[PDB]
Amino acid sequence: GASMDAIKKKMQMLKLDKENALDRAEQAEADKDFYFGKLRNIELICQENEGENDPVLQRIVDILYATD
Amino acid sequence: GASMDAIKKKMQMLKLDKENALDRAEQAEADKDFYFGKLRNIELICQENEGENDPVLQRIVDILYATDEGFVIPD
Amino acid sequence: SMDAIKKKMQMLKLDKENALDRAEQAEADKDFYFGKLRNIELICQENEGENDPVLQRIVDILYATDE
Amino acid sequence: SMDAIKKKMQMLKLDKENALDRAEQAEADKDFYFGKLRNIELICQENEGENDPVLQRIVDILYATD
Amino acid sequence: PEEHEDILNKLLDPQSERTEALQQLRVNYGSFVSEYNDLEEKVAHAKEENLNMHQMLDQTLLELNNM
Amino acid sequence: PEEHEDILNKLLDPQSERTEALQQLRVNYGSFVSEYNDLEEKVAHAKEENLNMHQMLDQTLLELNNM
Ligand SMILES: [Cl-]
Ligand SMILES: [Cl-]
Numbered sequence: 001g002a003s004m005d006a007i008k009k010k011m012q013m014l015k016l017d018k019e020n021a022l023d024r025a026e027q028a029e030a031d032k033d034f035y036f037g038k039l040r041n042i043e044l045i046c047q048e049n050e051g052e053n054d055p056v057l058q059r060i061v062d063i064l065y066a067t068d
Numbered sequence: 069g070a071s072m073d074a075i076k077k078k079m080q081m082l083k084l085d086k087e088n089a090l091d092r093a094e095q096a097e098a099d100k101d102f103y104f105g106k107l108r109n110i111e112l113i114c115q116e117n118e119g120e121n122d123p124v125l126q127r128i129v130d131i132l133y134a135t136d137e138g139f140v141i142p143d
Numbered sequence: 144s145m146d147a148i149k150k151k152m153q154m155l156k157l158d159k160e161n162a163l164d165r166a167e168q169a170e171a172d173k174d175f176y177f178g179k180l181r182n183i184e185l186i187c188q189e190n191e192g193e194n195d196p197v198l199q200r201i202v203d204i205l206y207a208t209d210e
Numbered sequence: 211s212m213d214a215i216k217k218k219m220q221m222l223k224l225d226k227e228n229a230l231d232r233a234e235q236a237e238a239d240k241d242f243y244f245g246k247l248r249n250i251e252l253i254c255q256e257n258e259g260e261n262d263p264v265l266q267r268i269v270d271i272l273y274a275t276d
Numbered sequence: 277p278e279e280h281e282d283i284l285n286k287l288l289d290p291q292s293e294r295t296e297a298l299q300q301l302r303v304n305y306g307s308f309v310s311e312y313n314d315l316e317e318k319v320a321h322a323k324e325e326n327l328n329m330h331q332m333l334d335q336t337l338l339e340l341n342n343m
Numbered sequence: 344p345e346e347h348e349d350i351l352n353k354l355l356d357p358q359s360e361r362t363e364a365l366q367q368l369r370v371n372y373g374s375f376v377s378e379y380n381d382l383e384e385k386v387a388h389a390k391e392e393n394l395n396m397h398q399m400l401d402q403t404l405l406e407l408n409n410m
Contacts, residue, residue, distance in 0.1 A: 001191045001192060001194060001397070001400075002188075002191040002192070003397070003400040003401045003403070003404040004329075004332050004333065004336070004400055005187070005188070005191060005202050005206075006404055007075065007336070007400070007403065007404055007407065008202065008203070008206040008336055009206050010079070010407060011075075011078070011079065011082070011206070011208075011336070011339075011340060011343065012206040012207070012208050014079060014082040014083060014086070014343075015082060015208040015343045016208065017082075017086050018082050018085045018086045018089065018343070021085075021086045021087075021089035021090050021093065022085075022089045024089065024090070024093040025089040025090070025092035025093040025096065027093075028092070028093045028094075028096035028097045028100065029092065029096045031096070031097075031100045032096045032097075032099045032100040032103065034136075035100055035103035035104050035107060036099075036103055038103075038107055038131050038132060038134070039103055039106055039107065041131045042110065042128055042131055045124060045127060045128060045131070049124055054124075056113065056117055056122070056125065057124065059113055060110055060113055060128070063106050063109045063110055063113075064106065066106070068102055068105075069399060071333065071337060072399060072400075072403045074337060074340070075336075075337075075340065075403065075407070076403075076406070076407065076410065078340050078343065079407065079410070080410075082343060114213065115213055118211050118212075118213050129213055129216065130216070133216040133217055133219070133220040134220075135220060135223045135224060135227070136227075137223070140216050140219040140220050140223065141148065141212075141215065141216055141219055148215060148219070151219070152218070152219065152222055155219075155222035155223060155225075155226050156222065158226050158229075158230075159222070159225050159226045159229045162226065162229035162230045162232070162233045163229050163232070163233070165233040165236070165237070166229065166232045166233040166236045169233060169236035169237045169239070169240045170236045170239075170240075172240045172244075173236060173239050173240040173243055176240065176243035176244050176246075176247055177243050179247060179271050179272065179274070180243060180246055180247065182271050183250065183268055183271055186264065186267055186268060186271075190264055194325060194328065195264070196328055197253060197257050197260075197262070197265065198264065199328070199332055200253050201250055201253055201268070203332075203335060203336075204246050204249045204250055204253070205246065205250075207246070207339065208339070208342075208343055209339065209342060210242055210245070277376075280372055281369070284365050284368060284369055287354060287361075287365060288361070288362065288365060289358075290357040291356075294354070294355070295355065298351050298354060298355060301351060301368070302348070302351060305347050308375050308379075311379070312375075312378065312379055312382065315379065315382045315383065315386065316382060318386050319382060319385045319386050319389060322386060322389035322390060322393060323389055325389075325393055326389060326392055326393055326396070329393070329396050329397075330396075333400075
């Protein structure tokens with residue numbers, strides 16, 4: 001009757017909330033990884049070229065290692 | 069009952085599962101923003117220097133504008 | 144090749160447009176179905192006290208989370 | 211500049227990706243709800259012999275248009 | 277009850293009364309079967325309601341496991 | 344059924360066996376009320392079980408809403 005139905009409806013809402021939160025987390029992690037992979041690759045490029053003491057690359061290196 | 073307690077336990081777990089996922093989302097979005105900030109500054113530096121045709125800067129440009137399929141406009 | 148780039152940019156725009164069209168249509172179908180489920184829910188809630196086993200099955204379908 | 215053309219091409223690809231993601235999710239949500247209506251239809255069909263006026267109202271919802 | 281025992285007392289020794297008394301017992305046997313049958317239906321109905329409630333709950337707990 | 348009527352026929356006309364036959368009716372009636380008794384208390388138990396389960400679910404819903 002009413003109480004069993006209300007319990008089932010509550011459980012469904014909690015489950016849907018959980019799954020929406022997991023979807024949001026997964027998407028945020030993917031976006032983060034997308035940007036992180038770029039910076040890591042740019043870091044590797046700078047490391048290939050560390051010897052040539054290029055002032056433009058030095059600016060880029062300073063950005064890579066700057067902190068919030 | 070045990071059966072009524074099992075309902076209460078799982079409801080707590082489902083709320084906790086949600087909270088843990090939201091924590092993950094918020095943290096990942098903050099890192100994403102931190103990273104994106106660096107990438108924008110780097111893009112601007114590359115753009116300033118496009119006229120030089122520096123192969124190392126042009127490689128960085130390709131990394132900047134790549135998607136999961138790889139480089140846009142290959143080679 | 145500049146021609147190849149123009150062609151590609153046009154294809155990517157059309158592909159995006161087709162997908163947005165798909166999304167809009169699916170969203171409309173989803174709203175239409177959800178509306179029926181809500182009406183069915185209302186009917187079930189009216190008969191809660193009747194303890195009808197068939198309506199109990201329908202309620203279990205309504206609140207199911209298994210896809 | 212080629213940098214600007216690459217930047218635009220990236221944006222078109224990512225927008226295409228976003229739109230497809232959105233269509234895929236919309237289709238999933240639609241199928242979820244449709245699957246429920248179909249399960250309810252089967253329950254109604256199984257119980258057609260009862261001549262239940264409540265079930266008949268439900269069937270009228272299932273087969274309604276627009 | 278108290279009436280049935282008096283009829284068994286009455287029937288112990290001997291024509292109009294003895295046949296009239298057995299017709300009381302012929303009615304009462306079928307009448308006791310009818311009353312038992314009516315009550316058994318009240319039991320079954322109530323057990324069917326109890327089972328419906330448990331089955332609803334059992335299934336809810338199973339679904340809960342997967343969430 | 345077949346046990347009963349046959350005894351009701353023996354007693355129609357006249358006899359130490361009739362005392363033995365009436366005792367068979369007395370014991371049967373006994374086993375009738377006692378079987379009905381067992382049934383009345385099955386009903387009371389099913390009613391109890393039903394009521395408590397509704398009470399438990401109603402009370403759990405209240406508790407769930409305070410949590
Ligand atoms: Cl209930
Ligand atoms: Cl490309």
